[PDB]
């Protein structure tokens, strides 16, 4: 709902920011780097505890 | 979604609802290039979007039936589902009878038509 705490809102915003796919230029980093973002949540799949 | 945004904006601007909004089928292109409430206003001014007149729930049947029922036509024992007290309560009948009779007695008492002893008698 609309009612939140400032702490909860900051945490939800950080989770929104983390919910992002890897930059494209990252795989090319010489020593073989990450291909995809394995830490990526979706509101349907997995819920935040909070 | 082809014209969903335009239908929603038009419902808002017309104060009806998207199920009373009429989008011109021969102007679907210009309607789809709307993109804003201002352009939906332009389209509404131009006639490519209309507020359909509310459908009819005519009352002429009920009105004729009500005239006849007041004449006493469809009120017989075969049309009554609720008890007499549920149709017309004996309590409200008594209440309005008492008020009518007390108003009459009190009008007669104010005039020199009855004594106050006769008033209390009849009350």
């Amino acid at each position: 709902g609309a009612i939140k705490t400032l702490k909860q809102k900051l945490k939800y915003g950080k989770k929104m920011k983390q919910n992002r796919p890897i930059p494209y230029w990252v795989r090319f980093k010489t020593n073989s780097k990450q291909r995809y973002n394995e830490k990526r949540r979706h509101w349907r799949r997995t819920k935040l505890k909070m | 979604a082809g014209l969903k945004l335009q239908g929603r904006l038009a419902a808002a601007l017309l104060k009806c609802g998207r199920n009373r909004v009429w989008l011109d089928p021969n102007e679907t292109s210009d309607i789809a290039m709307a993109n804003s409430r201002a352009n939906v206003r332009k389209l509404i001014k131009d006639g490519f979007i209309i507020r359909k007149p509310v459908a009819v729930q005519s009352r002429a049947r009920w009105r004729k039936l009500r005239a006849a029922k007041l004449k006493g036509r469809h009120t017989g024992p075969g049309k009554r589902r609720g008890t007499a007290n549920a149709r017309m309560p004996t309590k409200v009948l008594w209440i309005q009878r008492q008020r009518v009779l007390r108003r009459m007695l009190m009008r007669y008492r104010d005039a020199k038509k009855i004594d106050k002893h006769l008033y209390r008698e009849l009350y």
Partner: protein
């Protein structure tokens, strides 16, 4: 953590413009957004062409 008063003074110091009012959001991500309504004598467009918003 900027107050509306802090934002008023900071705005008047960065760009010497009197703020008629300040309203503030904390936008979802966690940034704090501020609308700064200028006095009628001021012109947000004439200020934006300085600031670089164009």
């Amino acid at each position: 953590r900027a107050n509306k008063n802090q934002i008023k003074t900071a705005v008047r110091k960065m760009y010497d413009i009197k703020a008629a009012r300040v309203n503030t959001l904390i936008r979802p991500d966690g940034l704090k957004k501020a609308y700064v309504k200028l006095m009628p004598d001021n012109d947000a467009l004439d200020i934006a062409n300085k600031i670089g918003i164009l």
